[PDB]
Amino acid sequence: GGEVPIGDPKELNGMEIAAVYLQPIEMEPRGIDLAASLADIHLEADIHALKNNPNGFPEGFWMPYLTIAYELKNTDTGAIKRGTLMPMVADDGPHYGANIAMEKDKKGGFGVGNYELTFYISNPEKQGFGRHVDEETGVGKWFEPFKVDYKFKYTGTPK
């Protein structure tokens, strides 16, 4: 298979925020996510620090401990589903991802067609990640929760 890019990457809040999908991915530990066999894609959010990141992250670093909720909407059929992307690592580094049933999902019309994808992104403090705030070593305040929107054509499992 391979990666299919979703929309255009956004630069916001000190971060580059890109979306891609792949074929379904076998994940460990088991039960952590939807089984590959029961899915049609693996959806990934690629989020890294820009230059001059205001929260202390070096350019290029992965942004860890983010809470990323998603909404995937087939605008042709109206079908909507939601979930969360979980942190994980592949051979090219860490990302946030989830296996998702598309055609396999008979509870809605999640077939090939036109989609809107939304990420709802909350800062690392929501998961207990800390920041220095002293004059000598501190960094700027975190972003408030925000959303990014992409549009793409889902053409089926990459093969």
**97 near Cu ion, judged by CB under 5 A:** yes
Structure tokens at 85: 């992307």
CA distances from 51 to 59, 77, 87, 94 (A): 5, 40, 23, 19
Q: Which stretch binds Mn ion (CB under 5 A): 40-48, 75-83, 99-107, 146-154?
A: 40-48
Q: What's the rounded Cα separation, in Å, for the pair 15 and 9?
A: 10
How far apart CA 104 and CA 88 sit, in angstroms, is 24
* Span of 37-45, 79-87, 103-111, 128-136 interacting with Mn ion by CB under 5 A: 37-45
Phi then psi for residue 126, to 5 deg, are -60, -30
Taking the least distance from each CB to Cu ion, the nearer of 32 and 78 is 32
What's 135's DSSP letter? T
Which of 28, 92, 136, 144 is the binder for Mn ion (CB under 5 A)?
92
Which residues would be at the binding site for a second copy (CB under 8 A)? 1, 22-23, 25-29, 32-33, 36, 55-58, 61-62, 64-65, 86-94, 97, 124-125, 128-134, 136-139
| Separation CA 20–CA 8 (nearest Å) | 10
Stretch of residues binding Mn ion (CB under 5 A), selected from 46-54, 56-64, 73-81, 103-111: 46-54
Q: Using CB under 5 A, list all residues that contact Cu ion.
A: 88, 97
